Structures are given as structure tokens and as C-alpha cells.
A paper describes a structure:
Cereblon (CRBN) is the substrate receptor of the CRL4CRBN E3 ubiquitin ligase and is a central player in targeted protein degradation. It is the target of the thalidomide-derived immunomodulatory drugs (IMiDs) and is one of the most widely employed receptors for proteolysis-targeting chimeras (PROTACs), both of which induce the ubiquitination and subsequent proteasomal degradation of target proteins. In our laboratory, we established the single-domain bacterial homologue cereblon isoform 4 from Magnetospirillum gryphiswaldense (MsCI4) for structural ligand-binding studies, which shares 35% sequence identity and <1 Å r.m.s.d. over 100 Cα atoms with the thalidomide-binding domain (TBD) of human CRBN. We grow MsCI4 crystals in complex with thalidomide, and then exchange thalidomide for the ligand in question in subsequent soaking experiments.
The IMiD iberdomide, which is about to enter Phase III clinical trials for different forms of MM, consists of an extended tail formed by a morpho­linomethyl-benzyl group connected via an oxy group to phthalimidine, which is attached to a classical glutarimide moiety. Compared with thalidomide, avadomide showed a slightly increased affinity, while a more than tenfold gain in affinity was observed for iberdomide. Most interestingly, the orientation of the protruding moiety was different in all three chains. While the glutarimide moiety shows the canonical interactions with the tri-Trp pocket, the phenyl ring is harboured in a channel formed by Glu76, Phe77 and Pro51 of MsCI4. While the glutarimide moiety of iberdomide is bound in an identical fashion in chains B and C, the protruding moiety is found in a very different orientation, filling a surface groove behind Trp85. In chain C, the orientation of the molecule could partially be influenced by crystal contacts with Ile70, Gly71 and Ala72 of the symmetry chain B. However, the protruding moiety in chain B adopts a very similar orientation, albeit being solvent-exposed with the nearest symmetry atoms more than 7 Å away, suggesting that this overall conformation is not the result of crystal-packing effects.
Numbering used by the authors: 16 to 123
The structure:
């Protein structure tokens, strides 16, 4: 009964990621960040995620992670904004920054 091992979309229950997949970027999986619109996000970095829909082409504008371009990551099921896919960087080349409070943690 591994009780807190997967992350689902809080809105619809789509399978998104796993506690096992948390990635400490610059020493911490958690990054508290603000966009140009002044919205605060508690971002959890994951090496891997699924069940998302990545919108458009990458942009480096206002990237919170040096060397990485982002794409908006929506829940592929309900279209809720869950965070961003990061690419074009180094070690790793790619990862997901997901908004912690938009995910529900629960058993495998
Ligand atoms: O890593 C990341 C992931 C993406 C994330 N971003 C960028 C971003 C935007 O970025 C496009 C954009 C940015 C700025 C403007 C207009 N300016 C002009 C001067 O500054 C204030 C208003 C228009 C469009 C537009 C809307 C939301 C976000 C958002 O959440 C972020 O910040 N860092
Ligand atoms: Zn959803």
C-alpha cells in the first residue's frame, strides 16, 4: 500500500508523474517563482511526466531555469495549466516544472 507515490491532475485525476521522478534542480526539487504577471508558483521539478499536452514552440523569455526554454504544459485530459516542459538546456537537456498545488498525491 504505497500511499503517496503518484501525482494526478487535481481537477480530473489524469496520471501526471511520480514521487520517484522528483528532480533536485540546483539542489532542491522545489522552486518558488513569479511570472511577469506577478503570479507566484511553487514549482516541483520532475525528470519525467505523462498525460500532459505541450502547447506551441519553446521560448527562453523569462525562463526561471538558466539555459532552458519552456513550453506550457496543460493536463492532456482537462486542459488545466499544470506547469511547463523545459528543453534546450544541459544536464539534463529536459525536465518538467509542475505547480505542486495543481497536483493530487496518492497511491500507485
Ligand atoms: O520559466 C518560466 C515559464 C514561463 C513563465 N511565464 C512567462 C509568461 C509570459 O511571457 C510572455 C510575455 C511576457 C511579457 C509580456 C509583456 N510584458 C512586457 C514587460 O514586462 C511586463 C509585461 C508579454 C508576454 C506571459 C504570460 C505568462 C507567463 C508565465 O507564466 C515564466 O515567467 N518563467
Ligand atoms: Zn486534468
Amino acid at each position: 500500500a504505497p500511499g503517496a507515490s503518484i501525482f494526478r491532475c487535481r481537477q480530473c485525476g489524469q496520471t501526471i508523474s511520480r514521487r520517484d521522478w522528483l528532480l533536485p534542480m540546483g539542489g532542491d526539487h522545489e522552486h518558488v517563482v513569479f511570472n511577469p504577471a506577478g503570479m507566484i508558483f511553487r514549482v516541483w521539478c520532475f525528470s519525467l511526466a505523462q498525460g500532459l499536452r505541450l502547447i506551441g514552440a519553446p521560448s527562453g523569455e523569462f525562463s526561471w531555469f538558466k539555459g532552458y526554454d519552456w513550453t506550457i504544459a496543460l493536463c492532456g485530459q482537462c486542459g488545466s495549466h499544470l506547469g511547463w516542459h523545459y528543453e534546450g538546456g544541459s544536464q539534463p537537456q529536459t525536465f518538467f516544472g509542475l505547480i505542486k498545488d495543481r497536483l493530487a498525491e496518492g497511491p500507485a
